[PDB]
Design a protein around this nucleic acid. Sequence first.
DNA 1: CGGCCTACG
DNA 2: CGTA
DNA 3: GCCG
Length: 327
Amino acid sequence: WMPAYACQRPTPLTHHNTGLSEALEILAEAAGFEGSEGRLLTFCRAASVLKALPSPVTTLSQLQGLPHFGEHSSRVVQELLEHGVCEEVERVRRSERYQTMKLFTQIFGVGVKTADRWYREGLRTLDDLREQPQKLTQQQKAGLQHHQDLSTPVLRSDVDALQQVVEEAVGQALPGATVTLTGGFRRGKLQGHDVDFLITHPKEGQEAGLLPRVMCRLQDQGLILYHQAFERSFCIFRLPQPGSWKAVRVDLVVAPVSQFPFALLGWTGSKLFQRELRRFSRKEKGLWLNSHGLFDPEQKTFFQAASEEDIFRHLGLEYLPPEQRNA
DNA sequence: CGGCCTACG
DNA sequence: CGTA
DNA sequence: GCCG
Ligand SMILES: Nc1nc2c([nH]c(=O)n2[C@@H]2O[C@H](COP(=O)(O)OP(=O)(O)OP(=O)(O)O)[C@@H](O)[C@H]2O)c(=O)[nH]1
Ligand SMILES: [Mn+2]
Ligand SMILES: [Mn+2]
Ligand SMILES: [Mn+2]
Ligand SMILES: [Mn+2]
Ligand SMILES: [Mn+2]
Ligand SMILES: [Mn+2]
Ligand SMILES: [Mn+2]
Ligand SMILES: [Mn+2]
Ligand code: NA
């Protein structure tokens, strides 16, 4: 029996149904490109259910009773099982609309609404966007300028180098402050599109004003290509390489230690795992979860947590380590 | 039928 | 809107 | 698209 919410089941990084899940995730992506966030969610959830199964699905029988599998997702799986391809998926794959929306939305600073407008205006290539620079925000100009580098997978060697320079800047800005790797690398991923760090200090309140101080120190060592009181920064770093450098996306977030378990849980993801966990919290337990805390709206109180385990327990969920949150 | 995670920049 |  |  398979629970309905992704936060109720372990999802490891390596699973047994990548072909089927990849196909459903193409339909999810395409649904988002057409502005159907509900269809996107169902296709994402169905793909995630397959990631949590212990074995390869070989027969449509094995889908009976699984949550988020109805007529549409079941037919996709049945065609892939019978023919090795799903006609709808292939039609989406090969479409100019899908290919261009994927290309544009993968730019840092460009989402579906922006990409769709550009599509409707006839634009199709990165060079098209470069030829009309005034249509671009500062953030989009940075994303486009560094697009090549940002399309190169970030590896663990890059993470370790980046954590060192971030720890050095953090320690110069505030003694005793700490840096925790989050995001997909904390979940055990070998690669990523960025590196995510969570910064705090053991003495509540000492972290006030920290992120501007850290950013100024990084910028003075020549490490910042793009950034921007604030507590989150979605940056592009100039990461030194042997004889050169490459641009890397880095997310920095500062939290007071009282919020650290909630920030750690939120920023560790996966993104689907966290939306599911917040949905579960509100719809099943009547509690409101975010990366700052867990709120009881009836008593008007916040749950004091010392650990991620505490949060799972307050929500009545079996604890899942980060490596099992790869929903 | 309506809901679908979340808050900051 | 973007982070996504 | 699926579900309460
Ligand atoms: N703009 C952009 N987004 C990308 C790229 N690659 C990539 O995975 N993403 C987005 O980032 C997600 C996975 O990246 P990741 O390895 O950092 O995973 P993560 O859980 O740490 O994601 P997060 O840092 O957003 O929390 C994907 O779901 C996708 O939407 C890319 O080249 N460009
Ligand atoms: Mn397995
Ligand atoms: Mn259908
Ligand atoms: Mn057939
Ligand atoms: Mn990441
Ligand atoms: Mn990130
Ligand atoms: Mn805050
Ligand atoms: Mn409806
Ligand atoms: Mn619908
Ligand atoms: Na984007």
